[PDB]
């Protein structure tokens, strides 16, 4: 109905493949190389998607970049959670059509804890009967859920925008009041997962030269420059609940 929902549908990215060799047996390096490549590819799509979001151009440019860089892992996790829900009912993790994790890959990548958390996130889509329209509006608000402790270059514009995305999530929800509690809670839970993924990726970047994992240039850069701001506590997420 709203103009709003039309937009999110219209701009929602399409299928992104990882380019993985599914004929080669699994190794840590191969799996982790194909996730890194996938990361880069999905980053490109998140950037394009973000810039077409309504009111996004209102932000100062450096806020535009910052916000995407900080929130990217979360958004990925979230959409990946859904992709897994819709495509295979959360029995496995649908990173991409050519990169679907089963438990064995969960263990081999050495991200079993983090993957486990994400499968549970996928299950929540099912348990809560999340609709495609709640998913899209939730995802758009994720982009506005993580900011530097010392705020942005133009905090006001950000706050306005975030406020209006909350409102719009409220419109498409509607004792229904309790729906909001749940979704806000489900949104809150994305952050600790992205944080665990941030640490893993960081640590991995740091040993990459020595485990034969290849990092695309834009990854290495984000993971080394922006991510450590999150892990050091300069950049914190916005939680609905305490």
């Amino acid at each position: 109905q709203p103009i709003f929902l039309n937009v999110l549908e219209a701009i929602e990215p399409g299928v992104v493949c990882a380019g993985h060799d599914n004929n080669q047996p699994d190794s840590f390096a191969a799996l982790l190389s194909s996730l890194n490549e996938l990361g880069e590819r999905q980053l490109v799509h998140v950037v394009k998607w973000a810039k077409a979001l309504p009111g996004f151009r209102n932000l100062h440019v450096d806020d535009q970049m910052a916000v995407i860089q900080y929130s990217w892992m979360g958004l990925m996790v979230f959409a990946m959670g859904w992709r897994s829900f819709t495509n295979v009912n959360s029995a496995m993790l649908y990173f991409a059509p050519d990169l679907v994790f089963n438990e064995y890959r969960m263990h081999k990548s050495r991200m079993y804890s983090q993957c486990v958390r994400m499968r549970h996130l996928s299950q929540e889509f099912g348990w809560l009967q999340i609709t495609p329209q709640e998913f899209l509006c939730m995802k758009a608000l994720l982009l506005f859920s993580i900011i530097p402790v010392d705020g942005l270059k133009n905090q006001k514009f950000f706050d306005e925008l975030r406020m209006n995305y909350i409102k719009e999530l409220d419109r498409i929800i509607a004792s229904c009041s309790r729906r909001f509690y749940q979704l806000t809670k489900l949104l809150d839970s994305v952050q600790p997962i992205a944080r665990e993924l941030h640490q893993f990726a960081f640590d991995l970047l740091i040993k990459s030269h020595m485990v034969s994992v290849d990092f695309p240039e834009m990854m290495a850069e984000i993971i080394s420059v922006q991510v450590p701001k999150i892990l050091s506590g300069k950049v914190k997420p916005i939680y609905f609940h305490t």
């Binding site: 535009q64 970049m65 860089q69 240039e217 834009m218 850069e221 984000i222 420059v225």
Partner: peptide, 7 residues
């Protein structure tokens, strides 16, 4: 940067 050099 490699992000602001492609934005």
């Amino acid at each position: 940067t490699l992000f602001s050099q492609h934005y």
